[PDB]
Design a protein around this ligand. Sequence first.
Ligand code: HEM
Ligand code: HEM
Lengths: 190, 190
Amino acid sequence: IPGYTYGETENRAPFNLEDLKLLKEAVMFTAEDEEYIQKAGEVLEDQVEEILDTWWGFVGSHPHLLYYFTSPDGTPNEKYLAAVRKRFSRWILDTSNRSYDQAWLDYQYEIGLRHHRTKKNQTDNVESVPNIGYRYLVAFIYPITATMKPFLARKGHTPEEVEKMYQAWFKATTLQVALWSYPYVKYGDF
Amino acid sequence: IPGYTYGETENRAPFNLEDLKLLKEAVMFTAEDEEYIQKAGEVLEDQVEEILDTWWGFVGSHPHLLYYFTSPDGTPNEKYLAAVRKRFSRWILDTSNRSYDQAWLDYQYEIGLRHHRTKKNQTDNVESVPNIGYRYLVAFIYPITATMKPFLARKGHTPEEVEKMYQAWFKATTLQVALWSYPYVKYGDF
Ligand code: HEM
Ligand code: HEM
């Protein structure tokens, strides 16, 4: 999966493992979500594609958001989308799967720098808009959560377990955006 | 309510009313939440204090978060807390109440600058830590949402209406943090 370089980013993350523990805490994330994030894997596992299709009907629907995949000529760069949709999809599983260790942190850095201007458009060697305004990375916490939910309601679990999955998911999407802001914030204020 | 200066901040917000409309959109916020945020008012209205008590048992519980109300001598500045807890509480209603107009935006700026170093500790003329790391303002989206919820389940409404209230609430807490990041982000990346 091209550009997907979890493990080998190898520039080193400006946040550490105490930083994470304390952010887990800000976000109410325990070991009790640890289990229940994993269980959302074996659930959302086989539906990834149908998920992407509901995702991309949100993005594709909104010109000022589709904006962010566009070539200078103001059309969607179709190469830029097929590529991301591969890595984004590996996100979903990674999230449910990787233990949140040093490696993990270094990609949470990576993935944030890719949204930023620092590394945007460089993974897929494409020419598009130079920065995604952080304001939207915060906003997508809502639609990355809400819309995952109907899909947790599926693989035949007890609605309580669905809640616990939902919530974990909400907690980890937030955690992630939270970290992503690193390259965005004025040095010293993160 | 001292320092509470909604309406008269009177420095002018670097985001506008198109910016808001488009962020509403990123956050799935429609006129259908408009109603249902209001209805959460007449619900959460009488329980504000019991809410603050569940809030402050989260904050009070966590030294690295209580951190942010502390005097230099590393104790909680009790004046700094009683004061904020008044304005924070006016937040809850404001949120349910104010139409999201120009005025509103200018306080969403205000309230973000107060978290920042730009205006932190100046409202209540107190001496405490100079900046709250943005990373935590993103993290508190989770606990500002989740924990509001049991309180929506109260004033005797049909669980569907409770969901619609919850969700609206989740959407508006996010919207707000999203904007708050303005003074935090490197000029040009918001
Ligand atoms: C919580 C919010 C978001 C999440 C969880 C998320 C998740 C992801 C992931 C996992 C990737 C692939 C990164 C990689 O594997 O290398 C990605 C890429 C991308 N997403 Fe996001 N994303 C979010 C916000 C946004 C927003 C708000 C937009 C605006 C349209 C956006 C547009 C893009 C773009 C342009 C890329 C490719 C960046 C590049 O490498 O040039 N994303 N996202
Ligand atoms: C979604 C997250 C948050 C929300 C919704 C929120 C809401 C509020 C509101 C409404 C106020 C009063 C502002 C005013 O009326 O002037 C306030 C003040 C304050 N909160 Fe937050 N807040 C959040 C994050 C945080 C975090 C993560 C901390 C860390 C402990 C924190 C600590 C404080 C402090 C120190 C003040 C007073 C700032 C000053 O004027 O010096 N807040 N918050």
